[PDB]
Amino acid sequence: GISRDSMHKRRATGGKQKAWRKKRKYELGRQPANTKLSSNKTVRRVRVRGGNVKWRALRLDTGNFSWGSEAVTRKTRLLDVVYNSSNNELVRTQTLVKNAIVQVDAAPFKQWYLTHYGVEIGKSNNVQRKLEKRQQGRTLDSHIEEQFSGGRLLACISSRPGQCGRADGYILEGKELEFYMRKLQK
Amino acid sequence: ARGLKKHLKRLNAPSHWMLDKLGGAFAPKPSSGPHKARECLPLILILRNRLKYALTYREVQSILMQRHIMVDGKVRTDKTYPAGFMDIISIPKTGENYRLLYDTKGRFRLHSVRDEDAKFKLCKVRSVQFGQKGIPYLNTYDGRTIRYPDPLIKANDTIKLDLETNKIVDFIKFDVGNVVMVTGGRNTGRVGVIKNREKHKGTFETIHVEDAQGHQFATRLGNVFTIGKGTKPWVSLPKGKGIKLTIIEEQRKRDAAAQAAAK
Amino acid sequence: VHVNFYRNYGKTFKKPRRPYEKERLDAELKLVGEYGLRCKRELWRVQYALSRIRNAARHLLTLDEKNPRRIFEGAALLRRMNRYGLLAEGQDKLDYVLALTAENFLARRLQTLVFKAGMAKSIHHARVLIRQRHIRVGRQIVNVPSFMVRVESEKHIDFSLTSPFGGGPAGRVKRKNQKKASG
RNA sequence: CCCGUCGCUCCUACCGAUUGAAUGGUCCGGUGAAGUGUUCGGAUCGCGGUCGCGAGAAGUCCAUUGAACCUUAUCAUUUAGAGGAAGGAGAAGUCGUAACAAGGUUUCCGUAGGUGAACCUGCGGAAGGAUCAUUG
RNA sequence: UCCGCCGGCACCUUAUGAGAAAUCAAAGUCUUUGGGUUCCGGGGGGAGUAUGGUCGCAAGGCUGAAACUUAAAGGAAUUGAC
RNA sequence: GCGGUAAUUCCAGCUCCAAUAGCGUAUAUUUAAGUUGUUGCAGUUAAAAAGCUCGUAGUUGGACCUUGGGCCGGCAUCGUUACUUUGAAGAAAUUAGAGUGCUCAAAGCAAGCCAUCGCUCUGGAUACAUUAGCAUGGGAUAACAUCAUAGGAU
RNA sequence: UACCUGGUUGAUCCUGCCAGUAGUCAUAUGCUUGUCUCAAAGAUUAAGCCAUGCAUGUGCAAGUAUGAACCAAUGAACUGUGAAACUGCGAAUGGCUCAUUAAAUCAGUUAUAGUUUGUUUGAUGGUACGUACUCGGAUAACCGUAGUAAUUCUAGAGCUAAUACGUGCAACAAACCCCGACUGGGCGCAUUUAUUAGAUAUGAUCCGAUGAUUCAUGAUAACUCGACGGAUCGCACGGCCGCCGGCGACGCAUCAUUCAAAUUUCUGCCCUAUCAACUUUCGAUGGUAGGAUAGGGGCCUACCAUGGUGGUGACGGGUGACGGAGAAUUAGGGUUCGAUUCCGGAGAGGGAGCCUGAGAAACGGCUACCACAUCCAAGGAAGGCAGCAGGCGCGCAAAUUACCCAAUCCUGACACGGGGAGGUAGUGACAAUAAAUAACAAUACCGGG
């Protein structure tokens, strides 16, 4: 099957390397998962070397995304795939891979922001005596806040969907975000 | 090739297993265990080839199944169990508590220790780090692992470890001026005092040792085993404890001829 | 695998480079004649052993005196020579062992000692008696004429208890004659 | 003593018209079994409330590893071949005498031409020459 | 004309040198074997031939085998014979 | 090289010779072979100096720089190598080699002794193992760049 | 034993080779062969083809007995042994061979801070709650209806078990993090992602490790349709008023260790230049981001750059080339060999693909194609001796279709079964060791002091 040997490759001198043994199991490869962004989730268990298990996600619709600045992780549904660094047809086909820019709805993050900072964007005495303390340092990026009204936040996938069976990631902020914005604006 | 090997050819056996070359095609492969299978003496090579208690690979089993062997304070039945260094082979009934010590020629000797000295042993100490939930553990050099060690204990130390109630009684740090027995290489079985340790950033910590009789020899950071604090070992050495080069062995043979017999 | 394959094995004689030389042929025949041998192999193997010993001694003498790998095997070689009655008590140096010769070895054979001890009428009678199980060294019967005796056992060669020459019953020839004369 | 052409016999190798022949290998191309993953599919089975859920075979779709066969080309090995032609060996020879003596034209190199064969001749060179020498 | 120095082409005498010898003042300082470096030979034929490569208008040049055959071919000197 | 009417060489008898339970023959290859030559061959005439010069890589490169000096746990930050010494790690088997009377030997790693309800803690040594790698001392002989715009040292 | 001798000439001194001389754990062969010990043995040619028989199975007190089984017993579940069968484990070791393979395997030396690891040893398992005095449905052996020419080929029916399969109380806490009633949710262990602590080295002031890490580890936010967190077996019976309790067996998870593998650093290999340039559009060298893998990596994909090796021999070709430890001969240096019992690699006729499993691209496992070849009732079925023995063929060239687990060891649930591994006998002038085939006297004959 698919193999990871240098057996079929060529020497650094550009000379053909002959074959002295067959293919071996401990050096095999497998077909790519080619994860898709779809509403009908499906993840299939794979049995790997040693008897352990890999989770090959064929279709996903939700994910676990983290806002690093406020350090809050929420489960939210991905809406679209907008950018792919490697192949430009992986966004047309809407394939979930690592480092692929996606859009996730901001409803859980809006709810957390409202219930934590006491401010809506997009009770007796303790709560009010503690809310203004969090409101003192409350500051948000304009580019970050302009997406709450739109309902979808740009984010980046940091997990490997075809290996862990999941699509987790982090919300784009700071120097990252505009770098992709200047690549997504037209 | 496709997996593990369950056979050990006689010619491939370790040298300290002095086995007759024309005794068979196979040697007893040491089982998985506390010791490295090349610095170990399997039980088959104890009741046989060292004691005349058993005569074949049929009476070693006939006396292990009676649960007559108690290595390191525990009955063991696997005839190829790797007793590897300073293990207390405590034969009950007859009372043959033996410490596995290293002969000056790299051999293995069953030093007959007294029973009350057989309730403990010593272990060399591998790295010491933090376990799960932040619980430090010991991880000695004979597979043993002890949780909650005293913070003074560090790597390469030695610990005096009890058997019936397995807890560290005391320990010796690794430093110059301590008795050390070498357990690897050509200098195996030679006791001495560490003079200085030389450190090379990257590998190969070399230890220089001074023999009691004036000789000096070097070895690796491994293969050494601290025995006692200062210059007094905590265990009884088998005999000699010195390298005893070939010429003085010839002298011993000569004087043995000229005395005792003397005729 | 066959474990018997692991038994070491070797050869003990060499044969000469030039096969047809008059002086060498007469020398070898001379030695064979009065040492009661069987062929030139019985002497070529003695030459081979002596050559090995001489080569070892010469290699030892090439080393420095204060070299332990000279002292130890020099002592061992001299011990073996003084043990086998080759070197005299007045020759305790590595130089004397280089001067050894084949007749020194052939003088220590059991047949030679039996002949020189007066027990045999001739060196061929000695070999015949040895091969017929009439001789014991110490307490052990020996029927190998090439048995190299040591000094400590030189005083124990004697006809065996079972031998008619050492106090045994008459052989089948004498018993047959007594049977004939009985009736 | 000795050289070559020619005539007879045997042995080895070479050139050689046949788009030779056979064998193995490689690249490209076409067909492409079977397995593996995926898509749809749903024979049937179990349970639940005369209503749902779960498992699931045949089949099918795409991708992938890819045996194997079928042409072309190419590489390597052995061999047939009319005819030509070269060496060697052979106690049978024919024709001369090229070399060894100043070998009867001193001998030999490079080059060019010529003739039955050794060879001859033109030009330059050498002594390994038959001269170590003409202050006469 | 006489003396001397450096450089060159040679020549004469003699080994205490070398060499199979002829002979050589270098062809010496070599079994008492080693200053540096390039090319190049391995018994005589086949043979500087076959073929491939390559330069040349060509004649040709550089590189360059094998099968097979053979017990000698050869160098220097010596005595005869011519 | 022998045999062409006297054969020391063929065919046989006798006698003798060499090895001897071993000997002959054929292939392959070690020696012999200083006829592959680093040690250690050759090149005027025996085979073998290129027609001659230039020329990069390669190989090879003048001399110069510590001697008198007798005695005899720290703590740095540094020209790099070759060479040489010492150490370590280094599979066994084979080889060399210590012990050991398998009846000897090739072998084996056994055994030996008072004459025991046993002992010798019985022994089951030790070398070498190119080169490359790791570490310690030495700096003679060698190779690299470093050498006067001071952009030097304190 | 650091060695020479014959052959060019009328004779001499050389160069020079031909022939002679001795060894070969080196193969044939020829003649001969009494004894003891020790031993190679279808490698060379064909990794060519195979009749036949064997070479891998396995049960302890301790998973599952109701044989309509045996041995004993005499209203109780079983309450002795136990065939078969389900379940678990093994068959990835050993054995054989050297075809492919020339920095490739392999040797010495490195690295995993780049990974997986049944097993053995040591340590460690608080969150299920939203019938627990113990849950559910099947099924084998068994019994009886069969099909087919046929095979450990195959279909129906009726019973019955689990440490098989599938559900489910997981039994009883603490600490902490969040949202919060005015003066409740989360939280075992495992997975994935993100943030954060892991210090220097308010007076008095905890905090590991490496040469080297954002490392070991801790806290936090969440996430997952989580084969995890004992519905299991043997022996002994006891102490507290129903309660409690011992010594074991098997099993699940994490870490360390052992058994290992995979990949990897540096240096090192025979002949050839009549092999001087090779590799790259389609991976050749590098970068970026992914995919895949147990894991690093052009290992693969998209985009980008034009690089990489070579007279210090790349590239290509030959090998009657597996590499090494080693073998023969050796004054020293050296030359030649290394299929074979020890280590490593590769293969099961030739290629390819794969299941199970901790471990295989396994062939005494499957699937397909090619080449052979086997029955057959002509519809189909089953193949792999480079395992042991044996046969054909090929050749100059190589033995018994024997006995046994007694030894060495390995494997299984296991003290107990099994082992063509291994040992023992048979053939054996491969090689090698010791060693008979007569010794003495008299007489006859002949010599020397």
Ligand SMILES: [K+]
């Ligand atoms: K298995």
Ligand SMILES: [K+]
């Ligand atoms: K290696």
Ligand SMILES: [K+]
């Ligand atoms: K990888």
Ligand SMILES: [K+]
């Ligand atoms: K398994």
Ligand SMILES: [Mg+2]
């Ligand atoms: Mg390290």
Ligand SMILES: [Mg+2]
């Ligand atoms: Mg004239």
Ligand SMILES: [Mg+2]
């Ligand atoms: Mg003429």
Ligand SMILES: [Mg+2]
């Ligand atoms: Mg003329």
Ligand SMILES: [Mg+2]
């Ligand atoms: Mg020639």
Ligand SMILES: [Mg+2]
């Ligand atoms: Mg005659």
Ligand SMILES: [Mg+2]
């Ligand atoms: Mg020569």
Ligand SMILES: [Mg+2]
């Ligand atoms: Mg000439």
Ligand SMILES: [Mg+2]
């Ligand atoms: Mg010439």
Ligand SMILES: [Mg+2]
């Ligand atoms: Mg010239």
Ligand SMILES: [Mg+2]
């Ligand atoms: Mg100089």
Ligand SMILES: [Mg+2]
């Ligand atoms: Mg010859």
